[PDB]
Design a protein around this nucleic acid. Structure first.
Ligand SMILES: [Mg+2]
Ligand SMILES: [Mg+2]
Ligand SMILES: [Mg+2]
Ligand SMILES: [Mg+2]
Ligand SMILES: [Mg+2]
Ligand SMILES: [Mg+2]
Ligand SMILES: [Mg+2]
Ligand SMILES: [Mg+2]
Ligand SMILES: [Mg+2]
Ligand SMILES: [Mg+2]
Ligand SMILES: [Mg+2]
Ligand SMILES: [Mg+2]
Ligand SMILES: [Mg+2]
Ligand SMILES: [Mg+2]
Ligand SMILES: [Mg+2]
Ligand SMILES: [Mg+2]
Ligand SMILES: [Mg+2]
Ligand SMILES: [Mg+2]
Ligand SMILES: [Mg+2]
Ligand SMILES: [Mg+2]
Ligand SMILES: [Mg+2]
Ligand SMILES: [Mg+2]
Ligand SMILES: [Mg+2]
Ligand SMILES: [Mg+2]
Ligand SMILES: [Mg+2]
Ligand SMILES: [Mg+2]
Ligand SMILES: [Mg+2]
Ligand SMILES: [Mg+2]
Ligand SMILES: [Mg+2]
Ligand SMILES: [Mg+2]
Ligand SMILES: [Mg+2]
Ligand SMILES: [Mg+2]
Ligand SMILES: [Mg+2]
Ligand SMILES: [Mg+2]
Ligand SMILES: [Mg+2]
Ligand SMILES: [Mg+2]
Ligand SMILES: [Mg+2]
Ligand SMILES: [Mg+2]
Ligand SMILES: [Mg+2]
Ligand SMILES: [Mg+2]
Lengths: 182, 188, 260
RNA sequence: CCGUCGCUAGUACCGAUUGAAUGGCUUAGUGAGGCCUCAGGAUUUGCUUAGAGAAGGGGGCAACUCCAUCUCAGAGCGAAGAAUCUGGUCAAACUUGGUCAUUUAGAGGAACUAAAAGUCGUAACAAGGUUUCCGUAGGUGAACCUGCGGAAGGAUCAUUA
RNA sequence: CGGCACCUUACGAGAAAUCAAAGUCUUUGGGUUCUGGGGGGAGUAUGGUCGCAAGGCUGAAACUUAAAGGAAUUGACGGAA
RNA sequence: CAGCCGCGGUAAUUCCAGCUCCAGUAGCGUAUAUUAAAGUUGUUGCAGUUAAAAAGCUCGUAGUUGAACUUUGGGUCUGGUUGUCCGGUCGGUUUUUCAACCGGAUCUUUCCUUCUGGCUAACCUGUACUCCUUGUGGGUGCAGGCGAACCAGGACUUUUACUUUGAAAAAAUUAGAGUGUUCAAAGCAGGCGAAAGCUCGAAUAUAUUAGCAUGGAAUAAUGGAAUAGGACGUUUGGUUCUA
RNA sequence: UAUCUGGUUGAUCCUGCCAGUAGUCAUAUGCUUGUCUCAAAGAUUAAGCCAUGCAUGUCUAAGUAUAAGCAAUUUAUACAGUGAAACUGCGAAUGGCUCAUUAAAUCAGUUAUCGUUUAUUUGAUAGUUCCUUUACUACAUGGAUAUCUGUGGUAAUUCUAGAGCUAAUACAUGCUUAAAAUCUCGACCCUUUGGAAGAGAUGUAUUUAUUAGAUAAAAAAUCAAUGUCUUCGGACUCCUUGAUGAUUCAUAAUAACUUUUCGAAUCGCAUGGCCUUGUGCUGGCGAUGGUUCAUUCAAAUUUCUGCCCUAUCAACUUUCGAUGGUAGGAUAGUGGCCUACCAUGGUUUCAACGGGUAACGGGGAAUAAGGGUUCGAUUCCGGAGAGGGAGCCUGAGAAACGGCUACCACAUCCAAGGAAGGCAGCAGGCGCGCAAAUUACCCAAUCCUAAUUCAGGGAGGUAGUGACAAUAAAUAACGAUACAGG
């Protein structure tokens, strides 16, 4: 007796397993945006799916009338903030077709690679994992972070650790020690 | 134990309502008092909310009231004369609410002798005037007079003595009284 | 079950506490007082979650013991004393005098009231009967019973109580076009004028009430409290002033007012 | 390709045992225990002026210039009050029966299903070599036969005058 | 005006034989009753009920099994022509 | 081995091992339930000539359903609400040239429930006629009196169903707004100063069963004057009143 | 985030099912298992059985304290500092657990109590206890009982028999403090216009009576009772009354009874004001009690409508209350709740009644185009139960089970005479099973209880076990040289 802590089995498997073309597409996507599993892709789809559903619901009521106007607008704003939606497209019916690729492209995964820094997607991911990259001055180590666009210019190498250039970092130290010994 | 559950009582239709829960205290009903007339006895019973509730037992006496005059007195009861629910309460002689009874009447007579002072059954100079001013107001309905003469006024007790403890009632007058008399006659 | 229940579980706790879903099993059961459990506010919830003058229950208790708190003149020491609508909580250290008044959303707003106004208490009229020795007495929906009220103080009127003495300063007659404050359900916390009174024999007297924005709404009579005459309320009401904006409007207000 | 009769497994079905078990109701008889109730009175005492010995037993021989005085034989009047107890009442349970449900042994019976190679037939399918069916009776070793009436899913949408 | 009855296209249908209804049904709703939900076990077991009976109405499961059916197509075949 | 289809009978891509390889991935398999798929339970939304399925036939109470007909049409103003016509403006705002759309009042042979009275707001007024550009621009002003501007009490409502908005349908859940738990699953937090104090929040929506409230009068029923014992009322008598 | 594929076939299109496929805060299990946050977890079988331990007690400036205790010293010649023990108080009826019953029952929303109880709560509030009125309980009434200390029994048990003292907000008794007004009684005079000296009774609860608690408008004639002012023709005038939709309501009087409730012989601080100079009469801040009326916490009922399968349940109810009545009894109160007497009703194909449920109800859960279907032991709200069934004490509130009394079923301890029991609290064990954790740490939080800032709390949290479920993601990255692709 406190209260049930809520959860969602958020990120959902497809209805057939082996639709070959689909599988291939998924693989391609993964290759493009360096994912560990299809799981991530599924999650992304679910995220987008929900949005699509919401849009549909909104449409099913009259645009001009209130809930549709407001909630939909809010959703659009959120999307824009995230950086999946463009600035040309803020008409709800544009959200309806966002696509998973776009979503993937907004990750701190790729927004490292897109801004240089890493060199080669996987490398960027690795860097993110290994306690480099601070979106603000607070070290993100989730690949699937989703960058805020408003804070995409602020993506730097970490204040601490190497590459940012505070400390050289372990192997380097060892080498130095060896040199000293010599 | 003795309960007042509508859980039991089959149903409006007839289906046997199963024993849903063991019966509660708030549903209870106690053993009957059925007060007789034979030495003054009272036992209280701690009810719901505490609250004592005097059970008359063998109750003698009680203030039976006039209507016409507007009075009552420290008056004894004689016997259970006619109870309209059940005649078993007349054999056993168990005084209860709306049972018809005979009233000692002496006290009443005494009171009258003060009140009007003309006597029923058959000094000082300014008090004479008072007396004159009073009286010839109520002529009384014959039966009552007879009862007075006897020493046994017909009343119906209307305090519930099993609840209240007191055995206070009502001198019978008019149509109701007549009816009661008739009933008595029928019985005897 | 088997007699009076003594606990209040934190989910079952009334929502206008604005308590955490988490952070302990229970919520404070507001004890027997002058206000109804769900339409009340205990002194824990006030001094911990709202004001944050106490970081925890113990602290609140300590404060109470110290006896700087006074809910309606008298002192109070009970953590879970139900201080309800209209009750004046004065903390003597700080001099932060409060009156418990509702927000437009519904929850109890912390109204930092002046010392001169926090002195009387406006209170409704629940009954008008006579007690023993033939003395007429009025009852308030906000706790008190006051002997000897001006004969033309009838049911569902409001009464300015001197509070220190516990008497009657003045009253407002309930009628058409007299400022009213709402204490029930979907319209709880709003403020309006009074237009109609649908009589209805037994089944709840309704009241059509318009606000400053010409937005009409309806409530039951028991859920309405007469606060003044239109323009001059007898109490200082919080920011918003019982208007209750639309959602869109609210959003606009939020995202127009960006003053860093 | 259809039945009878064989073999090997399993499912249920019926079924004597005066079967067995559990529970639910339930007749009659008993009836624990409390509650009230009719009494009953271990004990505890107050107030009565009820006579003391008491060394001022109320402020100096004396109804103490007698004090809730020394305090028990009083006895009267109470108040509280146990076991014990008369009738009720609620009624657990028990005893012996009766009954419904669900279980469960159960000799034997009579079935059905499975399995690849058993036996006597060739019933149906081709007008399947008596055209099939259906209903119904009666017979038979098994398909089955054969009355009667019906049907064509017939082996005919056909014979004009 | 009425019941016991052919031809074409079907745009209507229908799995197709065929159907002027077996049509106006995924462009799904005129009004109603009744019946069916893989095959077998089984119209059995049981209980009811109805009967003089024979039987009728009513009506299981266990268990079993990947087909049972329908319509037609080409064949093969027929003591059919 | 194989859910199923099936593979095995000396050439197994299906058994048993190596390599490769696939799928999912800190998870993946198996078992039973159950939901989807199943329009294979069908209200939406199935079938019944032959595939399972139309009672052999008619009668028939319940139930379920059930033809059409009673107020239609036109005018006259008057509120909005977005597109238009320029931004008249310091990317936002206020009218007109215009619009459709949704109301409201009315008048049309038309009552919307009717009165016993309170308040008659108003001028239908006209009592003195004029503060005053040559005026029907404008109001100090009270006997007859428009009552809808509200009550506060009768009188008696044909009654439903249907639908409207409302008030109530505990919180958690669900949907959902806000917000950097590092991200999220979450959580009700937080946010900003001189960083001496100040400060946003803790929304909104759902749930349609029944009851309450109000508007609507199409649809569907119900009801009423055909021994008119009917309706009204300047009836004129009366009778029973009640008070 | 509306999706279908393999299988009868020689091949074909259907009926049709099987099979696959996807999900499950849906269980189990098989492998495996590095980390972060989150975390269900003996419901399913046996509401089966339970060793051990713990889970309810608790005192403030303020109830009692000569512990022959502590501690001690610069209020006690009745007491005053702390305080074991015990009596008084209050609490133990909450919480926690579990889902056996239970199918118009529970439950959901919705009404109602003008149909009732309600410790607690905060608001309120009682000159009348007297009983003839020339000599009477107040600046303080009584005796007990426990701690203790002593005399013990027992094989044992949270077992308690006798003496000695000893208290109380124990528990019993019991004082003050009237004026007025109204109602019942009363020495006569003087022939009416009649009119009074003076005596008794009247709080609050209790009981039935009985009255008031009004209210649709103006104006009379006069018949019986016949009052005030007469400025002696006659006038008569200003004549009371809450709330509700609604009462025999609130409420106030008259009348009595009453084994006469209540009406502060109460504890901590502080120690003021007038002198009629007594130690006089007086007066502050608080505690607790105590009356009905409020309120609050609640409480029983109660209105309307709504439940899963079954006709291989069509009649049921009504001897033994069924339906209604009348009256009583009882109850806190409504009521066939129970009793007496009478009537013959009441429900039903709009499925009554019966049977089943591997049924506690709802919030909700899973699935997810729309409609649905299945599940809901389980964190919230209700309801039931504490092995079964019964009964009751105390109490505001229990038909309580960490209360009692019994019987059944189970079981312990014994010196055999007798005692004690009830984990569906927590932990743990057996048992059953496909199937479920530590006999851990603490009140810091959360809240709860009391005499109550102070104690307690297996409620609650904290870890432990934990691949129930959920979220986030390491299991190399960048080079160079060396061999191949573009
Ligand atoms: Mg580091
Ligand atoms: Mg009481
Ligand atoms: Mg009401
Ligand atoms: Mg007995
Ligand atoms: Mg032949
Ligand atoms: Mg043959
Ligand atoms: Mg043949
Ligand atoms: Mg033969
Ligand atoms: Mg079948
Ligand atoms: Mg090989
Ligand atoms: Mg299904
Ligand atoms: Mg079908
Ligand atoms: Mg057929
Ligand atoms: Mg047929
Ligand atoms: Mg037939
Ligand atoms: Mg019609
Ligand atoms: Mg959500
Ligand atoms: Mg579907
Ligand atoms: Mg076939
Ligand atoms: Mg084949
Ligand atoms: Mg399947
Ligand atoms: Mg269990
Ligand atoms: Mg509980
Ligand atoms: Mg009266
Ligand atoms: Mg009354
Ligand atoms: Mg009665
Ligand atoms: Mg269920
Ligand atoms: Mg059950
Ligand atoms: Mg449940
Ligand atoms: Mg169960
Ligand atoms: Mg519960
Ligand atoms: Mg047990
Ligand atoms: Mg019990
Ligand atoms: Mg226990
Ligand atoms: Mg308990
Ligand atoms: Mg346990
Ligand atoms: Mg497990
Ligand atoms: Mg616990
Ligand atoms: Mg572990
Ligand atoms: Mg890591």
């Amino acid at each position: 007796p406190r209260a049930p802590r809520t959860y969602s089995k958020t990120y959902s498997t497809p209805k057939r397993p082996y639709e070959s073309a689909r599988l291939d597409a998924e693989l391609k996507l993964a290759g493009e945006y360096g994912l560990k599993n299809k799981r991530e892709i599924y999650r992304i789809s679910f995220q987008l799916s929900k949005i699509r559903r919401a849009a549909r619901d909104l449409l099913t009521r009259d645009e001009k009338d209130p809930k549709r106007l407001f909630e939909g607008n809010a959703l659009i704003r959120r999307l824009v903030r995230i950086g999946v939606l463009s600035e040309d497209k803020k008409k709800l019916d544009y959200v309806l077709a966002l696509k998973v690729e776009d979503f993937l492209e907004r990750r701190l995964q790729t927004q490292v690679y897109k801004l240089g820094l890493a060199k080669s997607v996987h490398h960027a991911r690795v860097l993110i994992s290994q306690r480099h990259i601070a979106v603000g001055k607070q070290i993100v180590n989730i690949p699937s972070f989703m960058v805020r666009l408003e804070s995409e210019k602020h993506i730097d190498f970490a204040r601490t650790s190497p590459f940012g250039g505070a400390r050289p970092g372990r192997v380097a130290r060892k080498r130095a020690a060896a040199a000293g010994g010599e | 134990g003795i309960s007042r559950d509508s859980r039991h009582k089959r149903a409006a239709t007839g289906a046997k309502r199963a024993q849903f829960r063991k019966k509660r205290k708030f549903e209870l009903g106690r053993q009957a008092a059925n007060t007789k007339i034979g030495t003054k006895r009272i036992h209280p019973v701690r009810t719901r909310g505490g609250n004592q509730k005097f059970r008359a037992l063998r109750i003698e006496t009680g203030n039976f009231s006039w209507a016409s005059e507007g009075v009552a007195r420290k008056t004894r009861i004689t016997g259970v004369v006619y109870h309209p629910s059940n005649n078993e309460l007349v054999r056993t002689n168990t005084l209860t609410k709306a049972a018809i009874v005979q009233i000692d009447a002496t006290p009443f007579r005494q009171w009258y002798e003060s009140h009007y002072g003309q006597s029923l059954g058959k000094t000082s100079k300014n008090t004479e005037r008072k007396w004159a001013a009073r009286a010839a107001e109520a002529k009384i309905e014959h039966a009552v007079d007879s009862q007075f003469g006897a020493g046994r006024l017909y009343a119906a007790i209307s305090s519930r003595p099993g609840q209240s403890g007191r055995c206070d009632g009502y001198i019978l007058e008019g149509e109701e009284l007549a009816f009661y008399l008739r009933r008595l006659t029928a019985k005897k | 079950a088997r007699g009076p229940k003594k606990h209040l579980k934190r989910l079952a706790a009334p929502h206008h506490w604005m308590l955490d879903k988490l952070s302990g099993c229970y919520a404070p059961r507001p004890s027997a007082g002058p206000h109804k459990l769900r339409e009340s506010l205990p002194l824990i919830v006030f001094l911990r979650n709202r004001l944050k003058y106490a970081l925890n229950g113990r602290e609140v208790k300590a404060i109470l013991m110290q006896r700087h708190v006074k809910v309606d003149g008298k002192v109070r020491t009970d953590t879970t004393f139900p201080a309800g609508f209209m009750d004046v909580i004065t903390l003597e250290a700080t001099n932060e005098n409060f009156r418990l008044v509702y927000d437009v959303k519904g929850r109890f707003a912390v109204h930092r009231i002046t010392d001169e106004e926090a002195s009387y208490k406006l209170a409704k009229v629940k009954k008008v009967q006579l007690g023993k020795k033939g003395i007429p007495y009025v009852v308030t929906h906000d706790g008190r019973t006051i002997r000897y009220p001006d004969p033309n103080i009838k049911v569902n009127d409001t009464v300015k109580v001197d509070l220190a003495t516990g008497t009657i300063t003045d009253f407002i007659k309930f009628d058409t076009g007299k400022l009213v404050y709402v204490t029930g359900g979907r319209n709880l916390g709003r403020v309006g004028t009074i237009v109609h009174r649908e009589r209805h024999e037994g089944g709840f007297d309704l009241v059509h009430i318009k606000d400053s924005l010409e937005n009409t709404f309806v409530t039951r009579l028991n859920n309405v409290f007469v606060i003044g005459e239109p323009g001059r309320p007898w109490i200082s009401l919080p920011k918003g002033k019982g208007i209750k904006l639309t959602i869109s409007e609210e959003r606009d207000r939020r995202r127009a007012q960006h003053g860093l």
